[PDB]
Amino acid sequence: AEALNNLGNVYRKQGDYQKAIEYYQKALELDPNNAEALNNLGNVYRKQGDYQKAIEYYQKALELDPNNAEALNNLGNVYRKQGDYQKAIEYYQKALELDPNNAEALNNLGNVYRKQGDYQKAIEYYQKALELDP
């Protein structure tokens, strides 16, 4: 399944999303509890705009590893892209509970608050993000 994963990665990198979904799904048939295949699938579904399928494989990935800040963040992103800001915040906060120094989670939390109109919170979360790396 590592070869199938690699094939999917290449097509995914070159934007051939439907070919990438094929190869990731083939990796899941060999190891149905493959974290990399499950995460990579949610990645392609998110990039495609299939937000229900992205949630499906992102929630499947969090079942096997509830400490994937990368998946926790991408689940929040998928919820933000479908306008569910309450769920998106909940997931960015889950990613910050795990790692309070997550620059993408802090940046994404400021982004959602800006979209919401809570600019006082947005400035607070954006400041936290720059307080890490210049």
Residue numbers in the entry: 3 to 136
What does the article say, verbatim?
Here, we use single-molecule optical tweezers to study the folding of consensus-designed tetratricopeptide repeats (CTPRs), superhelical arrays of short helix-turn-helix motifs. The starting point for this study was a consensus-designed TPR protein (referred to as CTPRa) that adopts a superhelical structure within the crystal lattice.
As was observed for CTPRa, the C-terminal solvating helix was not resolved due to a higher preference for end-to-end stacking between molecules in neighboring asymmetric units. The resolution was sufficient to determine the change in repeat plane angles using the Cα coordinates: while the twist remained almost unchanged, an increase in the curvature is compensated by a similar decrease in bending. Circular dichroism spectroscopy of the 5-repeat proteins used in this study shows that the CTPR α-helicity remains intact in the new repeat type. Whereas CTPRa variants unfolded and refolded at a plateau force of ≈12.5 pN, the plateau of CRPRrv was significantly lower at ≈9.5 pN, indicating that the introduced mutations have a destabilizing effect. Importantly, the overall lower stability of the rv-type arrays relative to CTPRa arrays is due to a larger destabilization of the intrinsic energy than the destabilization of the interfacial energy (ΔΔGunit ≈ 3 kBT and ΔΔGnn ≈ 1.7 kBT, respectively). On the contrary, a single CTPRrv repeat is unstable (1.1 ± 0.2 kBT) and requires the energy from the interface with at least one more helix to fold.
